[PDB]
Design a protein around this ligand. Structure first.
Ligand code: HEM
Length: 184
């Protein structure tokens, strides 16, 4: 179940966030903690491709080796708040599972600056969801969360100390695939 109406950043700068570059998940918190593993790797690219607002996702479970990419088309609900479809693809953009009505996620950018961000997502696959999932992002895959984003976690009435870090998992990412997937 998802339970939060996440509030987007006041004055969110869409073009800076959606610039075509990669964001790495450094820390995450699911309000239903059992919905996601204790150790995980995730990243995304976000940009406009031929006029269309896009995200490309990467998930990797470093214990099981479960790997998947997605390409997402975002629709705007309000500034910094989106509803995304998703198609599962290989790293080259070939479709494995096509876009379907019931497979979507919401995506809210609660805080962003040039180097860091805090997002909320509620994933739906048909009647199932993956809970309220918060993620701290950085442009540098090895960056410890700094004061701007940690303060934003506090301003969301959350505690950064309770987030799970991805840093001890030897995460390695294919940036090139994430950037190219934006076009697919
Ligand atoms: C960065 C933001 C994220 C977004 C927008 C997002 C989005 C999604 C989407 C769209 C899927 C379904 C993919 C498909 O079936 O084609 C998915 C699956 C999943 N995600 Fe995320 N995700 C993000 C981060 C994370 C993180 C940090 C974790 C933490 C462990 C996570 C754990 C999972 C798991 C375990 C699944 C598989 C769900 C199932 O099997 O039904 N995700 N995610």
């Amino acid at each position: 179940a998802c339970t939060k109406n996440a509030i987007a950043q006041t004055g969110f700068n869409k073009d800076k966030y959606f610039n075509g570059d990669v964001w790495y998940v450094t820390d995450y918190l699911d309000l239903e903690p059992d919905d996601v593993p204790k150790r995980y790797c995730a990243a995304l690219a976000a940009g406009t491709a031929s006029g269309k607002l896009k995200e490309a996702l990467y998930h990797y479970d470093p214990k099981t080796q479960d790997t998947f990419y997605d390409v997402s088309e975002l629709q705007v609900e309000s500034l910094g708040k989106y509803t995304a479809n998703f198609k599962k693809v290989d790293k080259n953009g070939n479709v494995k599972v096509a876009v379907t009505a019931g497979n979507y996620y919401t995506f809210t950018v609660m805080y962003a600056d040039d180097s860091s961000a805090l997002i909320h997502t509620c994933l739906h696959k048909g009647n199932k969801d993956l809970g309220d999932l918060y993620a701290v992002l950085n442009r540098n895959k090895d960056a410890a969360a700094g004061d701007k984003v940690k303060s934003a976690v506090s301003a969301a009435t959350l505690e950064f100390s309770k987030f799970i870090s991805t840093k001890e998992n030897n995460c390695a990412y294919d940036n090139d695939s994430l950037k190219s997937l934006l076009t697919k």
